[PDB]
Amino acid sequence: GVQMLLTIVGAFAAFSLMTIAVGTDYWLYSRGVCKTSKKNEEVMTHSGLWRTCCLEGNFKGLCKQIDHFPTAEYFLRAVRASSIFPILSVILLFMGGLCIAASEFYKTRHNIILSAGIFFVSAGLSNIIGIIVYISANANSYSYGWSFYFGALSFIIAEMVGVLAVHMFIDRHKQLRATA
């Protein structure tokens, strides 16, 4: 009833939050360049997962790319460049929502709901790895931005949906036991 309503709304919120995060560019408020003479000038910048967009100076708004590649160290940089894990969480949350949608249509197969639970729980775990792999590769002051907090917040909103989905599975099977 109303329990399913929360899951749907919460699942949509988690998905939406994470997508904004990845797509945006406000993850790490650092102080670097945004333009590929022998001169230079570091100005406050708001970095992202893909592009380092300046927010101060004469280059205000110029969005440069990030050369993540300027064997432990190689693997870290390789993973951090493609954003496998952060993008993987997006894919998992999207898939976890399809399952919940598929439920209404197929209401005789309880494993549709438990699938959503595993995707949502596993989507949170990918988000944790993404945060860790972004904070470790990234390492004169810094202060994470609203985009980075939408990721962290997505994790929480996706773990809560995960437990909620698992209760739905548990609860459904409990009703079957009664009918037996």
């Binding site: 595993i118 596993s122 775990l125 944790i128 790895i129 860790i132 904070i135 470790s136 390492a139």
Partner: protein, 39 residues
């Protein structure tokens, strides 16, 4: 002076933890999947 430990220093304890959580679910699911094929 001294610095404060960063996530880079204690990094293999979060991969183990996350890897262990993954392994835990897998063990659980395979047991449940096996039991579900025996009914």
């Amino acid at each position: 002076k001294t610095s404060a430990l960063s996530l880079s220093n204690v990094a293999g304890v979060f991969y183990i933890l996350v890897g262990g959580l993954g392994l835990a679910m897998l063990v659980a699911l395979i047991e449940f999947c096996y039991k579900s094929r025996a009914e």
